[PDB]
């Protein structure tokens, strides 16, 4: 009687919401890795890409209009994603608490045969949340991880995104944090790119292997690019 | 009766195929519910308008045939006479109700499906236009009335707010399964019914009739109600009504479940009367609901007149002395769909098509009779309205030939009916013109036929010296108040023949034999 908003009523509907938001977030992650691949072209190309993100369709759309629409869509997707993930994590925790040997163990010898997707997904999701916060504070705003006099904020229509990236991955702690988050995001994609198709019902025996391979390809590409960026910056390949 | 019960299944199949929105279960299949007093759940229903959906399916089939050109529909056209040529019903004489035009139609067969005559009692549950003009004209033309005194009533009907009202809205008779019938003990009580204490409430049907507790048959309970209202109680706007109280049921059962059982009924009662039955007792009063009588028909649904077939409530047919619930719809659909198409074909195959046109002398005589009757009705210009005469006739028939009948009362009614008919034909006011939309003329014709039919009704009630079904004689009843049949002398169908004298019709007995269901 509420319509599509009846999805919030069931756990399966919450997983459908997470599947749609994860579709949006996987698209953004792939496009963001593709955009950040331009740092190897040079500071000019990377800064041109940064400036053109804001001028997306400028002759028709005002400055930062499409960028702000995308930012709002991303914020809504990530908020729905985290809300549904927290709800379902708490539901599964309650489902496990009553019958359990301990608060850290369920069975005496439980043997997993279909992977450890729950552990990796939940822990990596928490890590990705913290990393997104630290990332927006780090590269978008420059208020963390920067010595005084290294971050150049976008003034007017000239961008120093390349300089910010080069001076960002200098502290090995930040590089290690980015690398760990990229490992857990690689696991996140490796499971979720197939899991969103399975959660929406767009899966069967024939396409199961194809969707698993697509998830593997997406996760591998994103992982390789997103660990190439900070390692190249820290080791001196991008300067 | 066996033919009706046998073709009921085809009736339901046809109705489902036509798209009648019967109640369904969650699995997609049909849902059955039980009537009052029935031991099986054999009834298929729409929510509360099953008759509406059945007639809508039949009307959609009729519209399909009208579009196909096989059926010519003449709405707002009232058949005023039957033309019998060479002994066969070979046409009808009708009047257009808008232009007033008298038309003559000739046919190889004539079917009368004009419903019952329950409006001979002025106060009834039937539609305002329901009449007996067609069947009375056929009876005067040669058709035999089979048991004209067989009338069914409804126990629960919303009473009238004054002498102006002539229609009692039919409420479901399951309302008596959860209510208590009473009137104030004092004849004149100005207190609110909910303010009247329990000791001062005359809980009749409970103080009297201890047997059949809270499930008294509709006839006994309604006779008690009419006797109570005739003694003078003043509970209703005119004193005609009894309190069906739901207060103790609401205290006992959950008001939510009582709502789930009677919500539509309570909403309709509050709309009609302006009183919520959740706080005040509801008022009910008996009204004549059905007529199991009508023109006598044989197994082929054909009347005494060859070529005249009577179907539905207009014939006597399958209901005997009491119509069961959901049987009038069943009988009508059976006759229309699965019986008459065979019997009318059987009749027509033995006769030559055509051969009779509307220029025959019989058509001219019938048309002249109709025109003279209409002109006479318009020319009386009396001081009394048509509804006044109809009200007098209905009150006399309800008091004398209603649920309680006796020889003295029936003789009094047989004396009074010719007097009312003469007063009608000398002192009635029918305004307007014939060639116009004169509704007063339609009412005048219907009441003119009713005044003749009521005499035959009273004569048949007087002749049947027994009680059976709806027909109740006070001289023949069990100590419990039930009907007491005389199967030795009255086990027959009484078909009455119009002899030209309204007070002396000829009785024809059609003997009844029961090889399968033994009378008990």
């Amino acid at each position: 009687m509420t319509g599509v908003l009846t999805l919030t009523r069931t756990s399966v509907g919450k997983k459908v919401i997470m599947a749609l938001t994860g579709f949006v977030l996987v698209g953004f992650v792939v496009f963001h890795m593709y955009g950040n691949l331009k740092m190897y072209q040079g500071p000019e190309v990377y800064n041109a890409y940064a400036a053109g993100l804001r001028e997306l369709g400028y002759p028709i759309f005002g400055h930062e209009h499409l960028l702000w629409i995308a930012r709002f869509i991303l914020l809504a997707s990530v908020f729905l994603h985290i809300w549904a993930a927290t709800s379902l994590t708490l539901q599964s925790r309650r489902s496990l608490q009553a019958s359990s040997i301990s608060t850290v163990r369920r069975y005496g010898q439980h043997k997993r045969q279909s992977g450890y997707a729950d552990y990796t997904m939940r822990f990596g999701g928490v890590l990705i949340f913290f990393f997104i916060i630290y990332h927006i504070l780090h590269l978008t705003f420059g208020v963390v991880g920067y010595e005084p006099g290294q971050f150049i904020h976008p003034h007017g229509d000239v961008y120093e995104t390349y300089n910010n990236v080069v001076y960002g991955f200098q502290n090995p702690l930040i590089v290690g944090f980015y690398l760990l988050t990229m490992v857990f995001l690689a696991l996140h994609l490796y499971h979720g790119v197939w899991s969103m198709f399975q959660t929406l019902g767009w899966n069967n025996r024939t396409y199961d292997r194809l969707l698993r391979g697509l998830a593997i390809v997406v996760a591998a590409a994103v992982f390789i690019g997103n660990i190439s960026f900070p390692l190249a910056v820290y080791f001196g390949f991008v300067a | 009766v066996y033919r009706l019960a046998q073709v009921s299944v085809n009736i339901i199949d046809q109705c489902v195929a036509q798209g009648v929105p019967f109640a369904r279960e969650y699995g997609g299949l049909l849902d059955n519910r039980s009537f009052g007093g029935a031991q099986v759940a054999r009834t298929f229903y729409a929510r509360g308008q099953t008759g509406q959906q059945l007639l809508l399916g039949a009307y959609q089939a009729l519209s399909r045939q009208i579009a196909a050109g096989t059926v010519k529909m003449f709405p707002r056209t009232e058949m005023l006479d039957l033309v019998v040529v060479d002994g066969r019903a070979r046409g009808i004489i009708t009047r257009d109700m808008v232009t007033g035009k008298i038309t003559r139609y000739a046919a190889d067969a004539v079917v009368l499906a004009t419903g019952g005559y329950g409006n001979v009692f002025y106060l009834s549950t039937n539609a305002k236009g329901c009449n007996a003009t067609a069947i009375w004209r056929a009876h005067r033309r040669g058709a035999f009335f089979g048991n004209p005194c067989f009338t069914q009533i409804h126990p629960t009907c919303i009473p009238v707010s004054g002498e102006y009202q002539s229609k009692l809205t039919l409420m479901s008779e399951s309302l008596r399964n959860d209510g208590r019938i009473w009137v104030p003990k004092k004849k004149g009580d100005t207190r609110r019914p909910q303010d009247i204490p329990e000791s001062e409430r005359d809980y009749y049907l409970e103080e009297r009739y201890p047997s059949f507790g809270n499930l008294v048959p509709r006839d006994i309970a309604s006779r008690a109600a009419k006797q109570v209202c005739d003694e003078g109680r003043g509970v209703g706007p005119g004193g005609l009504g009894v309190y069906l109280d739901f207060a103790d049921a609401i205290k006992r059962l959950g008001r939510q479940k009582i709502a789930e059982r009677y919500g539509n009924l309570f909403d309709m009662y509050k709309q009609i009367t302006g009183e919520d039955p959740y706080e005040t007792p509801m008022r009910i009063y008996p009204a004549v609901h059905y007529t199991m009588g009508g023109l006598w028909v044989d197994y082929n649904l054909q009347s005494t007149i060859p070529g005249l077939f009577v179907i539905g409530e207009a014939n006597f047919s399958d209901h005997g002395a009491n119509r069961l619930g959901a049987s009038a719809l069943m009988q009508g659909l059976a006759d229309g769909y699965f019986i008459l198409p065979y019997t009318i074909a059987n009749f027509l195959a033995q006769v030559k098509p055509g051969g009779v046109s509307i220029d025959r002398p019989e058509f001219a005589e019938a048309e002249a009779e109709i025109n003279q009757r209409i002109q006479r009705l318009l020319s009386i210009r009396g001081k009394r309205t048509v509804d006044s005469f109809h009200r007098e006739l209905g009150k006399l028939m309800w008091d004398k030939c209603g649920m309680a009948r006796n020889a003295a009362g029936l003789r009094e009614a047989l004396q009074r009916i010719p007097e009312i008919r003469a007063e009608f034909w000398e002192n009635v006011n029918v305004p307007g013109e014939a060639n116009d939309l004169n509704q007063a003329l339609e009412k005048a014709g219907r009441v003119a036929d009713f005044l003749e039919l009521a005499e035959l009704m009273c004569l048949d009630a007087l002749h049947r010296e027994e009680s059976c079904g709806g027909h109740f004689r006070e001289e023949y009843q069990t100590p419990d108040g039930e009907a007491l049949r005389n199967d030795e002398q009255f086990s027959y169908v009484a078909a009455w023949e119009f002899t030209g004298d309204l007070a002396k019709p000829r009785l024809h007995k059609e003997p009844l034999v029961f090889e399968y269901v033994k009378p008990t």
Binding site: - | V9, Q14, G19, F22, Y26, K72, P237, Q271
Partner: protein, 257 residues
């Protein structure tokens, strides 16, 4: 109650009508509106005047004969009821009530308040049915109809054919009636085989009979005695779009006999 009535009085279709004023000294609040009209008719007959003519058979809000535009609203001020179901307790002492017939080109006025509503019959004749003959029906339980679909088809099928939707529609359109029948037949599996033809034919008939178009105003649902929703009109619109996609052409319209 003292009640003033401005009643439309028209001698016939050709004669132009006028509003006539009738004062009722005593009106019972429990008395129905049609009962008050009957009392006025008796008073007129006693005074020698011509009684007011109006359509009425059942007086239960089921048949659909009653058709009165009372004080600007079809079937009276109260919604979800008919003229016969309207009682004088809905009015106040000294009130002026304007009684009118349906005003539509496809609904000719025959008398004071009587209206010719055969255009609805011709709309039904143009495919508002299931073309099943007698004796050919399978078993009643052969085709399963879900309870929700049956409930919606009964909501649509509960249409008394009063024509108040045409009367209160500013365009004089039969959209609610046609939509109700189309939705009733379309929601059942028996109405599927000819549904996409039916709607087109029915819509064409409503165009041929002389009804207006649907501006989606919604007065039809507001004044409908049976509370038929605009979802029926949406269902008809979907059916007509799908039939246009299938290239469904309307048949020859039903000509009056």
């Amino acid at each position: 109650m003292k009640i003033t009535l401005k009643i439309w009085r028209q001698k016939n279709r050709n004669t132009p009508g006028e509003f006539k004023t009738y004062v009722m000294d005593n009106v019972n609040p429990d008395m129905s509106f049609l009962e008050m009209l009957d009392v006025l008719n008796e008073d007129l007959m006693s005074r020698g005047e011509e009684p007011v003519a109006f359509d009425h058979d059942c007086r239960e809000g089921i048949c659909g004969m009653c058709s009165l535009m009372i004080n600007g609203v079809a079937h009276g001020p109260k919604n979800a009821i008919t003229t016969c179901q309207l009682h004088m307790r809905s009015f106040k002492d000294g009130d002026t009530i304007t009684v009118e017939p349906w005003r539509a080109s496809a609904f000719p006025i025959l008398k004071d308040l009587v209206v010719d509503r055969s255009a609805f019959d011709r709309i039904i004749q143009a495919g508002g049915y299931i073309s099943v003959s007698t004796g050919s029906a399978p078993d009643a339980n052969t085709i399963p109809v879900s309870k929700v679909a049956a409930d919606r088809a009964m909501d649509a099928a509960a249409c008394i054919g009063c024509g108040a939707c045409v009367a209160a529609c500013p365009n004089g359109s039969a959209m609610l009636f046609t939509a109700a029948k189309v939705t009733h037949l379309a929601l059942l599996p028996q109405g599927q085989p000819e549904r996409y033809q039916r709607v087109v034919n029915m819509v064409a008939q409503a165009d041929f009979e002389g009804f207006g178009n649907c501006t989606n105003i919604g007065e039809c649902a507001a004044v409908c005695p049976k509370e038929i929703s605009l979802e029926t009109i949406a269902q008809l619109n979907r059916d007509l779009v799908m039939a246009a996609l299938r290239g469904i052409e309307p048949n020859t319209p039903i000509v009056p006999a």
